[PDB]
A and B are shown apart, each in its own frame.
With several copies, the nearest count.
Chain A
Amino acid sequence: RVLFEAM
């Protein structure tokens, strides 16, 4: 998985 996260 690629859990890039940005808000």
Chain B
Amino acid sequence: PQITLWQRPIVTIKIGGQLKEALLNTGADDTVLEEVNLPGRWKPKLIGGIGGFVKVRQYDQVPIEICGHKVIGTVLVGPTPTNVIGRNLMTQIGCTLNF
């Protein structure tokens, strides 16, 4: 699809069997969700935003479905204001910016 930017570009994601929604975010290296049902091990990591740096949980090799495209990648769980899909996953669904 071709998605304009008059509103937040939010799409449906599926993760650990749950429907969530997340913002396609070209300004994020990484994918960050507030809360997942992934039951296993994670590694403590830190990310930075405009305001400073925060602790996240890093989950590796996560099956995740974006907008009906099935991918595998790294999902971070952290204190983000809204779920964001980063470039790490957007590259895998062949997402580009165009003008």
* Whether chain A touches chain B in the assembled complex (some CB pair under 8 Å): yes
Type the 1/0 row for B49-75, where 1 means its CB is closer than 8 Å to any CB of A.
Answer: 110001000000000000000000000
Q: Which residues of A contact B45 (CB under 8 A)?
A: 7
**Complex Cα spacing A6 to B86, Å:** 10
Query: Helix, strand, loop or mixed for chain A's interface?
Result: loop
**Complex Cα spacing A5 to B30, Å:** 7
- The reply to whether A4 and B82 contact each other, CB–CB distance below 8 Å, is yes
Cβ distance B94 to chain A, nearest Cβ, rounded Å: 21
- Beyond the given A1-B29, A6-B81, A7-B76, please list 16 additional residue pairs across the A-B interface where CB-CB is below 8 A: A1-B27, A1-B30, A2-B25, A2-B28, A2-B84, A2-B86, A3-B82, A4-B23, A4-B28, A5-B47, A5-B49, A6-B28, A6-B30, A6-B82, A7-B45, A7-B47
12 contacts between A and B (CB under 8 A): A1-B28, A2-B27, A2-B28, A2-B29, A2-B32, A2-B49, A2-B80, A3-B27, A3-B28, A3-B49, A4-B82, A7-B48
